[PDB]
Amino acid sequence: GHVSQVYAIRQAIAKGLVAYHQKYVDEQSKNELKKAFTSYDRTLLIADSRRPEPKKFGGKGARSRFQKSYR
Amino acid sequence: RYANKRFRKAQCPIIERLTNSLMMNGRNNGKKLKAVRIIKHTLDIINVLTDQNPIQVVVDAITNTGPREDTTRVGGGGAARRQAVDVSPLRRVNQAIALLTIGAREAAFRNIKTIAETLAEELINAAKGSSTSYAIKKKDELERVAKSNR
Amino acid sequence: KIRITLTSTKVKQLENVSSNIVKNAEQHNLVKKGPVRLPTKVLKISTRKTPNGEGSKTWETYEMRIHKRYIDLEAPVQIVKRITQITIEPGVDVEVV
Amino acid sequence: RGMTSKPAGFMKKLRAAKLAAPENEKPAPVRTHMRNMIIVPEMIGSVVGIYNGKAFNQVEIRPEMLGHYLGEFSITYTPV
Amino acid sequence: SKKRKLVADGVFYAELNEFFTRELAEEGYSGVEVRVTPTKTEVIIRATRTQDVLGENGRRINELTLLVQKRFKYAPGTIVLYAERVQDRGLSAVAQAESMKFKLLNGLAIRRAAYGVVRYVMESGAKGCEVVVSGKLRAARAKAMKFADGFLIHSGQPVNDFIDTATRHVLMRQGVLGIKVKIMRDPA
Amino acid sequence: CRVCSSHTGLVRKYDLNICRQCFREKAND
RNA sequence: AUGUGGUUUAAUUCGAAGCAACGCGAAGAACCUUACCAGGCCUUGACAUGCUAGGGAACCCGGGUGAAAGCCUGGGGCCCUAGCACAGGUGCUGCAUGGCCGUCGUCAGCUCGUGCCGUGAGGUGUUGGGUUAAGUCCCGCAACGAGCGCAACCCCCGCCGUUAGUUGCCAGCGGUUCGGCCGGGCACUCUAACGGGACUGCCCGCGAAAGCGGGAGGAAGGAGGGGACGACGUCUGGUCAGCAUGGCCCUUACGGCCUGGGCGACACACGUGCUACAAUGCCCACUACAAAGCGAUGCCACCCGGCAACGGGGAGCUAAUCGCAAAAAGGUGGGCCCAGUUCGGAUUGGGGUCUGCAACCCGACCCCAUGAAGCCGGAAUCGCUAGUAAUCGCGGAUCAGCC
């Protein structure tokens, strides 16, 4: 979708920027655009592995669990 | 509590993290886009009606809205007394932002295709330039409750 | 234009198998396309364990990744001879156009 | 409401109803689960009992009644 | 196989297995692998006593193999019948299980029969072994019996155990009693 | 189905097994 | 809407019952299904090998009564009878059982060997302090180690690379019926096989240590996300109605066929849900991004008749190359202007399509009219810790059709 594409393109421009020059792409990808200890600054360099998520049984959504009532 | 504080990406227009938080408060059903728009449009509303720059108006609003002290119940030997206590700096923001959006939703004015005017008006009403509106009321009411049972 | 499709559970069982077919046919036909990979698809199936019968209640989840290999051989001739007797590994299911 | 070109009617009652036709009619009822059937004129005058699921209800079918389903005559839900 | 008759192709294998288990029991059935191409199926029955299967000078192997053809017509296609000897029946969980299941049918002390079997299996090769008997031990109240030796540990955990497993039933006047045999061999 | 004859739910393809159960059973060993 | 309690009924078949029964067995109740009810019908037997005896004996077409079965019988022209050896029941019992399943519980335990303590049962270890998802690890200790279990080894999803290119794209060039269609090209997506990557490894802080907090890089972390692996056992848990099976019971029937009715009844009670009460919205139009699936009489392109459901005609597909398919939320423009309303669609009248022998009981769909309650819900109560909740549409199994 358009959202997904926005992310892919964002990654593209992040990666290409690195190939052109290692220097420019800094910390997320290379130096400042490149990487960090822990928290992702933007971390444009990484490919968000998140995928929809399969629906587990016993749960409506996958994660979402049905609520309990006094019943 | 719920989880560790996740850092939020700063706002695309004005790279203010606090703004994104506010936007998150507005959004529901993950309609991040509509949520951002309403806030932006409100900011435009803040520009026309008020000479001041929106970013300043909003921040001032949150300040007026943050409760310094809140009352929390506790069980003493008899009855549960409501102990007054300070509020975490983190806690104050979440309350302020939440209360703004709620009060904003509260407003009768249904302006813009969406909610966007209510946010715009709410924030100004909040400012202490204008420290009125439903949001501030809750804030004032909590503080009043505290120190009542000092 | 004999398109050959080689599918198997084990990646090696094919590499061996499809490779053999490449060398053999080299003798009596054109020069093969060369074992083309064709990506591996994984299938997840949630179904009754057994067919209609015992334990309809049963279920289970299966994932079976299956591998493919084409290696096309255009301009056929006594390719058939070198191929027909020559095969080896079981664990492979080959079908040809 | 026209289901199709040819009105459906299950054969259990049809074959049964018609046989009654040459003798005349059949006294007493008939009983069929096939509420699904549409009623045809040969049915007229007859008394076919239909299945609530609970029981079979006597339904005399008259002419005004023909186009109907028969099931329409035996109500499944009761206030009881 | 074929979309159309993979199932049909399958039904036959059960048909073949059906007879072999019925007949070959004395021989000591272990497994019946079935490989196939067109009208020429493999079927290589593994047995403890290859002799019992073959017959004398291969007389029985003829009848059985012939019986096979009746069931497997040209449409199923003629089939061969290979027979391999089981080196050390003591290693085959199926056999070890069947072995105990038989004794139980005899009315032998189950606990002991179990010890012996673990011992035999343990005795020749096998890094580890374990036997389980169902209930109605000695036609008594339902119970369960165990016995094991050597590391079944490092088995049971899926990681390349190579543990042969086998179950054998035991019809009895009192009732059925399942037997489980686990044999641990060098892992991968 | 074909083997067990449990009608309740046999896959057509195998058209076998008691149902899913035997399908799983045969598969199991 | 749906399942249940209850009540009603000729019958409303059966089971399930606190969590762990109640959109549960039912991934498809009009006849069928179907086990219930009404009415019509069918004993060596619906099937196996066989015995003595009388008798017509192959066989073909009718009638009477009937719900059907069956029974009686007319009759063109191997089989019946009498005595003898010998099926079917979803009818009872899950406290007689197998199998399989639910459950505490994905929860952190259960032991052994030797030593040591105790007259002994037994204890110590496995306890204590820190820590962990964990008997996980650390420090301590008459204990030192070990086995089953935890974790890991296996599978699917996250990032990168090699190999492979009839999947793929002008990325890049020439042509075009400008369909990636043509040549060509493996770059890319992808296909499937293998390799790399994460280990608190590096930096700051506390700690005795394990490790806790924080930060950098990184697609990703401190078990990255989901499986397989649900232990010894517990509940006399659930299912003889899936199947299997001991025992009990029925055999002109507690079996079998059929037509029709019933499982769809209702004064009511509850559970799970759908739609909604609206402007962060509803309607019309224009316009844009997806994944995973399914297709032989099956998906249905396109063209035509119809407001439409749908009908007629008919191409391709045998399905990365054709079809289902439109993605909806979304973006752009317009309308509505706070009203029970251009909210909301119950209910009811009429017309009509479609499947099917047949849609009264009792199908879905279309179009006109109708346009209900509902303005956010008492006590009480449920879900979810991130790509989760929330929200939006898409596919599938079952399946003629479909609740």
CSV table of N, CA, C and O in Angstrom, one decimal, chain E residues 10-84:
chain,number,residue,atom,x,y,z
E,10,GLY,N,-2.4,-44.4,-3.5
E,10,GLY,CA,-2.2,-44.5,-2.1
E,10,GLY,C,-3.0,-45.7,-1.5
E,10,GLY,O,-2.5,-46.4,-0.7
E,11,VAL,N,-4.2,-45.9,-2.0
E,11,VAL,CA,-5.1,-46.8,-1.4
E,11,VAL,C,-4.4,-48.2,-1.5
E,11,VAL,O,-4.5,-49.0,-0.6
E,12,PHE,N,-3.8,-48.4,-2.7
E,12,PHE,CA,-3.2,-49.7,-2.9
E,12,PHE,C,-2.1,-50.0,-1.9
E,12,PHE,O,-2.1,-51.1,-1.4
E,13,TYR,N,-1.3,-49.0,-1.5
E,13,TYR,CA,-0.2,-49.3,-0.6
E,13,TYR,C,-0.8,-49.8,0.6
E,13,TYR,O,-0.2,-50.8,1.2
E,14,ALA,N,-1.9,-49.3,1.1
E,14,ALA,CA,-2.5,-49.8,2.3
E,14,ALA,C,-2.9,-51.2,2.1
E,14,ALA,O,-2.8,-52.0,3.0
E,15,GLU,N,-3.4,-51.5,0.9
E,15,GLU,CA,-3.9,-52.8,0.5
E,15,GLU,C,-2.8,-53.7,0.6
E,15,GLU,O,-2.9,-54.8,1.2
E,16,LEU,N,-1.6,-53.4,0.1
E,16,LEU,CA,-0.5,-54.2,0.2
E,16,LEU,C,-0.1,-54.5,1.6
E,16,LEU,O,0.0,-55.6,2.0
E,17,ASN,N,0.1,-53.4,2.4
E,17,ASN,CA,0.5,-53.5,3.7
E,17,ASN,C,-0.5,-54.4,4.5
E,17,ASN,O,-0.1,-55.1,5.4
E,18,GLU,N,-1.8,-54.3,4.1
E,18,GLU,CA,-2.7,-55.0,4.8
E,18,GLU,C,-2.4,-56.5,4.8
E,18,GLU,O,-2.4,-57.1,5.9
E,19,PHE,N,-2.1,-57.1,3.7
E,19,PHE,CA,-1.9,-58.5,3.6
E,19,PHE,C,-0.6,-58.9,4.3
E,19,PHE,O,-0.5,-59.8,5.0
E,20,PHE,N,0.5,-58.1,4.1
E,20,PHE,CA,1.8,-58.4,4.6
E,20,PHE,C,1.8,-58.5,6.1
E,20,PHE,O,2.3,-59.4,6.6
E,21,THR,N,1.1,-57.6,6.8
E,21,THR,CA,1.1,-57.6,8.2
E,21,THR,C,0.3,-58.9,8.6
E,21,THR,O,0.7,-59.5,9.5
E,22,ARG,N,-0.8,-59.2,7.9
E,22,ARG,CA,-1.5,-60.3,8.3
E,22,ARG,C,-0.7,-61.6,8.1
E,22,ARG,O,-0.7,-62.4,9.0
E,23,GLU,N,0.0,-61.8,6.9
E,23,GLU,CA,0.7,-63.0,6.7
E,23,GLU,C,2.1,-63.1,7.4
E,23,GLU,O,2.3,-64.0,8.2
E,24,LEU,N,2.9,-62.0,7.2
E,24,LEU,CA,4.3,-61.9,7.5
E,24,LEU,C,4.5,-61.9,9.0
E,24,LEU,O,5.6,-61.6,9.4
E,25,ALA,N,3.5,-61.9,9.8
E,25,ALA,CA,3.6,-61.7,11.3
E,25,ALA,C,4.7,-62.6,11.8
E,25,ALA,O,5.6,-62.2,12.5
E,26,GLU,N,4.7,-63.9,11.5
E,26,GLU,CA,5.6,-64.9,12.0
E,26,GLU,C,7.0,-64.5,11.7
E,26,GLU,O,7.9,-64.7,12.4
E,27,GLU,N,7.1,-64.0,10.5
E,27,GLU,CA,8.4,-63.5,9.9
E,27,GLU,C,9.0,-62.4,10.7
E,27,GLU,O,10.2,-62.4,10.9
E,28,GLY,N,8.2,-61.5,11.3
E,28,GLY,CA,8.7,-60.5,12.1
E,28,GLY,C,8.7,-59.3,11.2
E,28,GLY,O,9.8,-59.0,10.6
E,29,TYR,N,7.6,-58.5,11.1
E,29,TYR,CA,7.5,-57.3,10.3
E,29,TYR,C,8.1,-56.2,11.1
E,29,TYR,O,8.0,-56.2,12.3
E,30,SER,N,8.8,-55.3,10.3
E,30,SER,CA,9.5,-54.2,10.9
E,30,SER,C,9.0,-53.0,10.2
E,30,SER,O,8.7,-52.0,10.8
E,31,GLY,N,9.1,-53.0,8.8
E,31,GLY,CA,8.6,-51.9,8.1
E,31,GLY,C,8.4,-52.3,6.7
E,31,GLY,O,9.0,-53.3,6.2
E,32,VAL,N,7.5,-51.6,5.9
E,32,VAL,CA,7.3,-51.9,4.6
E,32,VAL,C,7.5,-50.7,3.7
E,32,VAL,O,6.5,-49.9,3.5
E,33,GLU,N,8.7,-50.5,3.2
E,33,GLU,CA,8.9,-49.3,2.4
E,33,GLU,C,8.3,-49.5,1.0
E,33,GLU,O,8.3,-50.6,0.5
E,34,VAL,N,7.6,-48.5,0.4
E,34,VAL,CA,7.0,-48.6,-0.9
E,34,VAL,C,7.5,-47.5,-1.8
E,34,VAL,O,7.1,-46.3,-1.6
E,35,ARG,N,8.3,-47.8,-2.8
E,35,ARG,CA,8.7,-46.8,-3.7
E,35,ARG,C,8.1,-47.0,-5.0
E,35,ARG,O,7.6,-48.1,-5.3
E,36,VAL,N,7.9,-46.0,-5.8
E,36,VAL,CA,7.2,-46.3,-7.0
E,36,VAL,C,7.5,-45.3,-8.1
E,36,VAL,O,7.9,-44.2,-7.9
E,37,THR,N,7.3,-45.8,-9.4
E,37,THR,CA,7.5,-45.1,-10.6
E,37,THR,C,6.3,-45.6,-11.3
E,37,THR,O,5.2,-45.6,-10.7
E,38,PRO,N,6.3,-45.8,-12.6
E,38,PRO,CA,5.0,-46.4,-13.1
E,38,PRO,C,5.1,-47.9,-13.0
E,38,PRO,O,6.1,-48.4,-12.7
E,39,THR,N,3.9,-48.5,-13.2
E,39,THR,CA,3.6,-49.9,-12.9
E,39,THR,C,4.8,-50.7,-12.7
E,39,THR,O,5.2,-51.6,-13.5
E,40,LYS,N,5.3,-50.5,-11.5
E,40,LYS,CA,6.4,-51.3,-11.0
E,40,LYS,C,6.7,-50.7,-9.6
E,40,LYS,O,7.5,-49.8,-9.5
E,41,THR,N,6.0,-51.3,-8.6
E,41,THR,CA,6.2,-50.7,-7.3
E,41,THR,C,7.3,-51.6,-6.6
E,41,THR,O,7.4,-52.7,-6.9
E,42,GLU,N,8.0,-50.9,-5.7
E,42,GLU,CA,9.1,-51.6,-5.0
E,42,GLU,C,8.7,-52.6,-3.9
E,42,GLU,O,8.9,-53.8,-4.1
E,43,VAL,N,8.1,-52.1,-2.8
E,43,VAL,CA,7.7,-52.9,-1.7
E,43,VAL,C,8.9,-53.7,-1.2
E,43,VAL,O,9.0,-54.9,-1.6
E,44,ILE,N,9.7,-53.2,-0.3
E,44,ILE,CA,10.8,-54.0,0.3
E,44,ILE,C,10.6,-54.3,1.7
E,44,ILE,O,11.0,-53.5,2.6
E,45,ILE,N,9.9,-55.4,2.0
E,45,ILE,CA,9.6,-55.8,3.4
E,45,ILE,C,10.8,-56.1,4.1
E,45,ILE,O,11.7,-56.8,3.6
E,46,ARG,N,10.9,-55.6,5.4
E,46,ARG,CA,12.1,-55.9,6.2
E,46,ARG,C,11.7,-56.9,7.2
E,46,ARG,O,10.6,-56.8,7.8
E,47,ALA,N,12.5,-57.9,7.4
E,47,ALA,CA,12.1,-58.9,8.3
E,47,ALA,C,13.3,-59.4,9.2
E,47,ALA,O,14.4,-59.3,8.8
E,48,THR,N,12.9,-60.0,10.4
E,48,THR,CA,13.9,-60.6,11.2
E,48,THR,C,14.2,-62.0,10.7
E,48,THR,O,15.4,-62.4,10.7
E,49,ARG,N,13.2,-62.7,10.2
E,49,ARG,CA,13.4,-64.0,9.7
E,49,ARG,C,13.1,-63.9,8.3
E,49,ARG,O,12.0,-64.2,7.8
E,50,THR,N,14.1,-63.7,7.4
E,50,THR,CA,13.9,-63.6,6.0
E,50,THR,C,13.5,-64.9,5.5
E,50,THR,O,12.7,-65.0,4.5
E,51,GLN,N,13.9,-66.0,6.2
E,51,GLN,CA,13.6,-67.3,5.7
E,51,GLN,C,12.1,-67.5,5.7
E,51,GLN,O,11.5,-67.9,4.7
E,52,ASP,N,11.4,-67.1,6.7
E,52,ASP,CA,10.0,-67.4,6.9
E,52,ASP,C,9.3,-66.7,5.7
E,52,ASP,O,8.4,-67.3,5.1
E,53,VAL,N,9.7,-65.5,5.3
E,53,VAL,CA,9.1,-64.9,4.2
E,53,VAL,C,9.4,-65.6,2.9
E,53,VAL,O,8.4,-66.0,2.2
E,54,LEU,N,10.7,-65.9,2.6
E,54,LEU,CA,11.0,-66.4,1.3
E,54,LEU,C,10.3,-67.7,1.0
E,54,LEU,O,9.7,-67.9,0.0
E,55,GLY,N,10.4,-68.7,2.0
E,55,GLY,CA,9.8,-70.0,1.8
E,55,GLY,C,11.0,-70.8,1.4
E,55,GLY,O,12.2,-70.4,1.5
E,56,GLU,N,10.8,-72.1,1.0
E,56,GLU,CA,11.9,-72.9,0.7
E,56,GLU,C,12.2,-72.7,-0.8
E,56,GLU,O,11.4,-72.9,-1.6
E,57,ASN,N,13.5,-72.4,-1.1
E,57,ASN,CA,14.0,-72.2,-2.4
E,57,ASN,C,13.2,-71.1,-3.0
E,57,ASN,O,13.1,-71.0,-4.3
E,58,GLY,N,12.5,-70.3,-2.2
E,58,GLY,CA,11.8,-69.2,-2.7
E,58,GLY,C,10.4,-69.6,-3.2
E,58,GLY,O,9.9,-68.9,-4.0
E,59,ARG,N,9.9,-70.7,-2.6
E,59,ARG,CA,8.5,-71.1,-3.0
E,59,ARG,C,7.5,-70.1,-2.5
E,59,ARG,O,6.5,-69.8,-3.3
E,60,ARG,N,7.5,-69.6,-1.3
E,60,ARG,CA,6.5,-68.8,-0.7
E,60,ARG,C,6.5,-67.4,-1.3
E,60,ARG,O,5.5,-66.9,-1.6
E,61,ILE,N,7.7,-66.9,-1.6
E,61,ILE,CA,7.9,-65.6,-2.1
E,61,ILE,C,7.2,-65.5,-3.4
E,61,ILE,O,6.8,-64.5,-3.8
E,62,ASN,N,7.1,-66.7,-4.1
E,62,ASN,CA,6.4,-66.8,-5.3
E,62,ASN,C,4.9,-66.6,-5.1
E,62,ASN,O,4.3,-65.8,-5.8
E,63,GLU,N,4.3,-67.3,-4.1
E,63,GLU,CA,2.9,-67.2,-3.9
E,63,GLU,C,2.5,-65.8,-3.5
E,63,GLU,O,1.6,-65.2,-4.1
E,64,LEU,N,3.2,-65.2,-2.5
E,64,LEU,CA,2.9,-63.9,-2.0
E,64,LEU,C,3.0,-62.9,-3.1
E,64,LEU,O,2.1,-62.2,-3.4
E,65,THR,N,4.1,-63.0,-3.8
E,65,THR,CA,4.4,-62.0,-4.9
E,65,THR,C,3.3,-62.1,-5.9
E,65,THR,O,2.9,-61.1,-6.5
E,66,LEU,N,2.8,-63.3,-6.2
E,66,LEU,CA,1.8,-63.6,-7.1
E,66,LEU,C,0.5,-63.0,-6.5
E,66,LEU,O,-0.3,-62.4,-7.2
E,67,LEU,N,0.3,-63.2,-5.2
E,67,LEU,CA,-0.9,-62.7,-4.6
E,67,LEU,C,-1.0,-61.3,-4.8
E,67,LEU,O,-2.0,-60.7,-5.0
E,68,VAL,N,0.2,-60.6,-4.7
E,68,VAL,CA,0.3,-59.2,-4.9
E,68,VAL,C,-0.3,-58.8,-6.2
E,68,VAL,O,-1.0,-57.8,-6.2
E,69,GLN,N,0.0,-59.5,-7.3
E,69,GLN,CA,-0.4,-59.2,-8.6
E,69,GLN,C,-1.9,-59.2,-8.7
E,69,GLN,O,-2.5,-58.4,-9.4
E,70,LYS,N,-2.5,-60.1,-8.0
E,70,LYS,CA,-4.0,-60.2,-8.1
E,70,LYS,C,-4.5,-58.9,-7.6
E,70,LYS,O,-5.3,-58.3,-8.3
E,71,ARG,N,-4.0,-58.4,-6.5
E,71,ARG,CA,-4.5,-57.1,-6.0
E,71,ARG,C,-4.0,-56.0,-6.8
E,71,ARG,O,-4.7,-55.1,-7.1
E,72,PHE,N,-2.7,-56.1,-7.3
E,72,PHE,CA,-2.2,-55.1,-8.1
E,72,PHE,C,-2.2,-55.6,-9.5
E,72,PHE,O,-1.3,-56.2,-10.0
E,73,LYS,N,-3.2,-55.2,-10.3
E,73,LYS,CA,-3.5,-55.7,-11.6
E,73,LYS,C,-2.5,-54.9,-12.5
E,73,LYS,O,-1.5,-54.5,-12.0
E,74,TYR,N,-2.8,-54.9,-13.8
E,74,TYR,CA,-1.9,-54.2,-14.7
E,74,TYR,C,-2.1,-52.7,-14.3
E,74,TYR,O,-1.1,-52.0,-14.3
E,75,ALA,N,-3.3,-52.3,-14.0
E,75,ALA,CA,-3.6,-50.9,-13.7
E,75,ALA,C,-2.7,-50.6,-12.5
E,75,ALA,O,-2.0,-49.5,-12.6
E,76,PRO,N,-2.7,-51.3,-11.4
E,76,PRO,CA,-1.8,-51.0,-10.4
E,76,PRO,C,-0.4,-51.2,-10.8
E,76,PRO,O,0.6,-50.5,-10.4
E,77,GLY,N,-0.2,-52.2,-11.7
E,77,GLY,CA,1.0,-52.5,-12.3
E,77,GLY,C,1.7,-53.6,-11.5
E,77,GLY,O,1.6,-53.5,-10.2
E,78,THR,N,2.5,-54.5,-12.1
E,78,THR,CA,3.1,-55.6,-11.5
E,78,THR,C,4.1,-54.9,-10.5
E,78,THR,O,4.6,-53.8,-10.7
E,79,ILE,N,4.3,-55.7,-9.4
E,79,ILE,CA,5.2,-55.2,-8.3
E,79,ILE,C,6.2,-56.2,-8.0
E,79,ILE,O,6.0,-57.4,-8.3
E,80,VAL,N,7.3,-55.8,-7.5
E,80,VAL,CA,8.4,-56.7,-7.1
E,80,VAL,C,8.1,-57.0,-5.6
E,80,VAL,O,7.1,-56.7,-5.1
E,81,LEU,N,9.1,-57.6,-5.0
E,81,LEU,CA,9.0,-57.9,-3.6
E,81,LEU,C,10.4,-58.2,-3.1
E,81,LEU,O,10.9,-59.3,-3.2
E,82,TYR,N,11.1,-57.2,-2.6
E,82,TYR,CA,12.5,-57.3,-2.1
E,82,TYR,C,12.3,-57.7,-0.6
E,82,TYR,O,11.4,-57.3,0.0
E,83,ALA,N,13.3,-58.4,-0.1
E,83,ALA,CA,13.3,-58.7,1.3
E,83,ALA,C,14.6,-58.5,1.9
E,83,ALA,O,15.6,-59.1,1.4
E,84,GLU,N,14.8,-57.7,2.9
E,84,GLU,CA,16.1,-57.5,3.5
E,84,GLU,C,16.0,-58.0,4.9
E,84,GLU,O,14.9,-58.0,5.6
